[model samples]
Target: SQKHLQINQTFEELRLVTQDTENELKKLQQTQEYFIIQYQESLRIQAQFAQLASPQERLSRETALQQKQVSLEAWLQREAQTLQQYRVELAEKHQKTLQLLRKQQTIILDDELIQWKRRQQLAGNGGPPEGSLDVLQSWCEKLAEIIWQNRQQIRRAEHLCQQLPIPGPVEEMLAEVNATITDIISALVTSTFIIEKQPPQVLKTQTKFAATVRLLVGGKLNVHMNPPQVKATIISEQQAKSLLKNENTRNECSGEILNNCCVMEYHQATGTLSAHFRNMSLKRIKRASVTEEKFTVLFESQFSVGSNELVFQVKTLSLPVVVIVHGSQDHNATATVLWDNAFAEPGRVPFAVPDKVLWPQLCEALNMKFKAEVQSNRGLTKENLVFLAQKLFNNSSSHLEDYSGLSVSWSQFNRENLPGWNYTFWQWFDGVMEVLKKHHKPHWNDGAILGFVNKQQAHDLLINKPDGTFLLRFSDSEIGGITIAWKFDSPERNLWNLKPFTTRDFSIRSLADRLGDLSYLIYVFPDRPKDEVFSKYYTPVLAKAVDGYVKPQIK
Candidate 1:
């Protein structure tokens, strides 16, 4: 009865606590609702206050707005007057530019006529010959085309100037005008030419250009008036050597001079056209491309000019004769010697070797070289080599061939000549893996092969050895691979939960040398065989027969 009474009191107390929790929840809900309603009511009151305005207050606000509008109108009017003044000045400058262009055009025509008269006198000591007249006419026509092109530029420049409207932004507009003016002036200066009877003298101009021209005619003419003549040597005061410096600005400076002289052929030879033109004889050169540094034109000129200048006008039409060679980043003697030997024959072309024929042979050679290098290195024991050979058991693909086939930056090679010396191991390993996966056929059934560990499992067992050593074996009629785990025994360690009977540590040696320790294993799988698997998987049966024949003890 007392136990029942205590239980009833506990139930009653629980009910009281539950009731208190419900009451608290109800109070919280009510408080949230009250706050939400208060916020809504305050917003509504504010809206009503904003809507309600006295007639006098509304009138006062309107009056202030009207005053501000009037002030804005006055400011607009003043800006309109200033814009009109600027437009007038711009129109005057535009007119002056057009006048200058027209003057340059007239001067070019006059120059053509003067040259024509000189040629006429030179022809049989008489007035213009038919050929000389034709040449002069063509030059004049080309000059007109240049003028027309400049005129089109002027119209475009003016149109650009017109885009700036009155009230918005004047700073950008002013800067644009200044630049336009400077360019127009420079174009005019470069376009105009001065020809004199005597050997022309160079004059330095604001444009930082000084040029001279002189013409030459043969001693006499034939009866048909077929005269051997030479044109003026167009020389610049500045060193006009390299023209291939900057690729972007080179095209702008390149032009067809007098229709007869134009960039017909080219290679990326020198600096930029910004360089001064050289005073070379036309007899010595026929083609050229100009750049800032040096001249490389003529079939041998400063820049590219050819038989068909028309074809070279479009950028793609131009063929770059110059070639850039990219090689591995690092240098090594072995690589240098190997690559050199690969293309040692003077007649052999670098890329002529067929991939199909080359890759296998190259891979073979590399494998041989790796073996020799590893054998010679004392630091790398035969055990290490065996380990490397085991590492190769997994794959067959060759990274050397893979990398060679795919484009790779040779510059990344650590050695200058023997690039990939360290990588030789990996390459050989990959080759061996490829051979195992593709070429080697297992005589034993896949299901029958027990104790065979995958790479991940082998690594796990390797890292987490409970004892100092581990031993896993698989066998078949023909060949099998095994995992032999080992450890240091100086401090007595358990291997597979039991101390090994022997305390001697394994001496590092070649796989063949180690195989001899276990005579029976070597007998089963000889030290020398067709492939590396024989040496790799060999295990020994060293104990003599016993009448007791006790089973191996397990922990």
Candidate 2:
């Protein structure tokens, strides 16, 4: 709600202020132009008075010219004073605009950009793509345009003050206006030089990937007045930290990007200044570590501002990437990035995140990641989270539904696997999430699957039902697995579990088809017939011939 309020309120306020400045500034420019013309006309009048020489009438002529010149001088003084007042009024409006620009820039940089970076980090864990750049780029472009308008207005005012030198400390106020508008422009130029397109954070070596670098104020500020080249280099965390420390290191790269240099293009139709790196290939990499360490692709460009009076060597880094040789390394890299995405605090040192977090916090992150990975609105329930808590802290287990006060470490989350499990906890969870996303999402949404139920829970519900009255439960032993368990209705037999199905099994033949093929799966638990629930999703009978050949069904 506050975001909406700002979007509508502060943005409108800024626009209004800029409009007022320009409207008034336009009048100021016109007034000064008239003043310059009038001064030249006064000079022309004095010259005409000089050449007239009549002996008897000279005194009268001199007297009239004196009167004319004296009246004109008075008019000049009055007009000049009015112009000074106008200058003050316009400058006051500019000050208001500059303040608004500062606030707008902060909102864009600290708030909006930070959230996007966070989203990008979670993207490594199979989250949705980061928020669209359309809104952000537009906002940035507005900033560019408004700031430049204000800057140009101030420059014109300064020129006017110079042409007709004012008596008061007029130059001082213009100096301040000049400095501040430039400051606003500088801020806009630097922050808007963003990765409109980001290189893959899960960077694969020897692969070609693309990114777009955009200067939001490019056209407005004349940033592309000269065609500028953007250079990219793969740099380590150490170098990144060095850059953060304000240390200058010249062109040192951990890896080489072939065709890293690109020229920025200005699109008049769209008012965009951008360079598209369409085919940047990593030719080689020198590893400081295997895959745990992170690197950033740093893009650098030099922008000449105000006809090369000053230059800003601008640089923007891609979100920290884990450079891996192959996709197999993605798992661990993902763990690191997801941890950073979920756990990293605001305004911290570069690449530093909490190695530990409260159990509840970690639980929240897991549910978000899981739900996002599965592309579902169904996040983990309290029971599922409680199960995770118990499994994670079984030695010192608390049976409470909420493990609110407990803490968890990165090691427990992914680095260490649970006892007797070959895969890590995250790997298992990721697998389970994928199975739900691909095969079980619809059934889960329809309440046909009781995924959180365990062995005792399943048996307790089913034992009183008739034979072959079964319930579906996710498997206890297999990774990313599901199974159907049914009551056999005999004193000696336990609720029996069919061989669990993995995503691979569901891929070959859907669970509905497989269940329909089985003769003994007569009903769902508590008297609901199986076909009544599953017939909609069941595959059709192989009614058509395979080139006039029919094969017998397995079940």
Candidate 3:
């Protein structure tokens, strides 16, 4: 602090001295006493010349006047040079003083680490005797004083640098110095102490704040004083029943169960942790996990976590939990509920979702236009549409569920011959073809229905069928309006496509209560069971397609 006082005093005096010198120089230039003396001397010399001969008098007078004029000019030039030198010196001194101040201040703030360490050592020995707090406070005050002094030095230096044409490196040095001062100031303000006498005690002179994750949704209610320190037990059977008793009857889209999908994070050394309550359907949920650490408990779940009910035990005197509802439209929907009053201690807990994501699913489930469009069209045929249908359906390749059963005979496809061809089957086939026409035709000219077409006056044109029939239909209403059907008669299988659908009971109440709840179930018939076609050839593709579709409803 004294050093800063000296610097400020130096700057003030130098500035004042420079001002005075400049004023003195200006006064010397403006005063006319010297000019008046020269004028009077000229008059006196001229008066003395009156009685002398004109030639002698004129020559003598001219020589004497020339000498006086030269002398006066020399005197004036000397004074001017002296004044300029004084001015430059004054400025240089002021600048040097300012630079020194800045350099000193720059280092002030950077020394916080040292002070921080010393304080820690002092407090680690329990209460430093009895008067130790005062000593610690004195250290804190000293740190503050040094920081203040350093700041003053830096400001003065900055001012001087601005006034002069400083080199790049010099300016950069000043900047670094200022940054150090800032660091020191920050540390001093956030000072902490820990005594090292025994194991080391902690004493905080400053408050540190940080971001932490809490597990509120799927955490255990009971405090598990187990091996890894304290952990909250995951959902208890009894707690799960109590919290989710009504979850079964609740609708997903409604305000009831959807309202309770949340997690909490507890930052220890704060207030109490609140109990995390959940209300999500267990049937839809797949898995849930819990993570615990000193002073915090976190509950996390996967697809089921969002929409299912969770249970946990609340410990008395635990930190109050701060719940963060996890159904947020974020890709990482992993949310955690807080333990009941578990954050009372100061620490952190984390929640994570390693496998699943929400935004993509949410968008798909919400009918986002960024993805594919699912629409069905009406089908009409001018001629033997059934033959057309059969051709569109039977186009076969490795894409087919059965390779050996690749060809379907004419009788196998004709609705007239296959009495089992219900309206549902035909309707499903028509919708699929429409999707193929809309989506695939433009891309491939052949659509998902790939084949070569020929027409005659009708009447059983030498019907030579391929290994697969011209028509194939699958009725899958339960999973989204998803249905896979193909036109197999073409040289290429072009009509292979998936359709969009949903099974919401409210949408079709007149059907079986479960009918709306259950989408249309499509059964795939292999050309030969011996081929083991469904599992080997088709399941992977369909599974991939389904994996692409199921979005978490709660998140």
Candidate 4:
């Protein structure tokens, strides 16, 4: 469990340290404002000098004001240089933190988020739900802390320039300076204002589901004054692209979200601020014009700072969601969501993804999907990926090296049906994954089931084996299935196969018990000793019924 000693811990440690750094960074801004603070005091002194009616006191007072202004201006110059050095030092510190943040987010979002999305893909394959958001939320919580502190410093900067303009370069280019500052603050607000708990990627209309959004900064002490209201609108794929391009297209939405509006609430226990829309459903859906349609729930809130002196227009798009109304539609919608989720890269332009990814990346996704789907300790092996690459590519290339630079496109993945087959590549792959995870996870975990071998490979391995030797393999022709390839030393050295068994078949009869029924498959591949390998999985026998008459067993 040393691995459990985690980045989760590191994130919190880093968060507090960054908070201290930024806290001192804030002091630099306030201290630097001492320069402007003097100018304001001098203006008051000048006013007092003008009010003097008598010439004798006026002469002395005016001399004092002149001297004071000159001395203040000169002191301001030195402080400005020191502040610049302070700024550079703090900014450099931020740059280092920023690099770390980039690595962490890449691990969390690029790696961790991909796992959740991959989990989502497996869910469509009849695996478990996308798993608890605790880990995801925990990681994101750390992200919120650092981003909030940065925003507070900039918010204070907004006031510094606005309260009074010190004479010199500070006042002359105030417009660009404020703009640059606003851009920094605005980017921070929008980027980290993330959807904490995601909507069901396979959303069903009229069924209540919930999603939560949090401004990373809003969760902290700042930015949630008087509470803010978040509005969720479901928008189409094209609309999302446009919104990404120009957020002014806010007036349009693809559909209505019931109970979508939520007020920001502060969690006293966690010190978090979020809008938890616990009761939300699609009132109706506007389908995408294309065959493979997609939509996203856009959560937006206008955050007020300094009594509306400055407001951040914050909006974040949810993970690409599929709106389904019927049971039949759910499958197709999920596949669409799966492809979008799987292929997407970081900094994507509103759910955009590459047409193709390298063979290794695809292999990695496949292994991640398989491991999670089964919740297994062992993942897909090299042989398993080779089996998949052959099918996916319809490739004639020999050796694993030949497929090294191969690419799998969206079409190759699931968009197009396989040649001479009714099912697409992913449909078959996910289906096989489904059945194994369903019926053979325990057997697969213990190495009793060699479910990745193809029929030809099974024959090659068992051709010279003794009688009653067999191996289990995923079915090449059938979806979500596996078959037993048995070799009979008698009958002219024959290799025979039973029809592939699927999830429905296994539900009625456990594979271990079924193997016991078929006495011919006595030895596992290369004589692994069937009883030795499988006895533990065999359903135990029951004693005779207590009643005089024994209960009849179903045939």
- Predicted model with the maximum TM-score: 2
Q: What would the per-residue lDDT of candidate 4 be over residues 85-181, giving only the tens digit for each residue?
A: 5654555555556556656655765566666665654454334687655556566666656555554554554455466443444343434434544
| Residue-wise C-alpha lDDT for candidate 3, range 1-555, written one tens digit per residue | 555465455445544544454454344333334544554665665566564566756787777767876676676556445444443443444345445434433333334333433343222211122222333333333334444544554565455445433244445555666666555443333222111111101101121212111222112211111101112222322233333343422212111112223334343443212223332221211122211111111122221211134222222111211212232211111111111111112222222212222222211211211112222121232222333333334432223222323333212322222234332322333344333433333312312222112222111221242222222222334211333332234466323333433333214431123221222212222222212222221212223334565643321
C-alpha local distance difference test of each model: 0.31, 0.78, 0.31, 0.73
**Comparing 1 and 4 on lDDT, the stronger one:** 4
Question: lDDT, candidate 3, residue 161?
Answer: 43
Best by lDDT: 2
What does the lDDT read for residue 336 in candidate 2? Answer: 73
Better of 2 and 4 by lDDT: 2
- What are the models' TM-scores? 0.19, 0.80, 0.19, 0.71
Residue 369 shift from truth in candidate 2, angstroms: 3.0
Shift in Å, residue 1, candidate 2 = 9.1
Name the candidate, 2 or 3, with the larger lDDT value.
2
User: Which candidate order results from sorting by lDDT in descending order?
Assistant: 2, 4, 3, 1
Q: List the residue pairs that clash in candidate 4.
A: 431-480
Q: Give the better candidate number (3 or 4) by TM-score.
A: 4
Model 3 alpha-carbon drift over 4 Å, by segment: 1-132, 193-293, 296-555
Model with the higher TM-score, candidate 1 or 2: 2
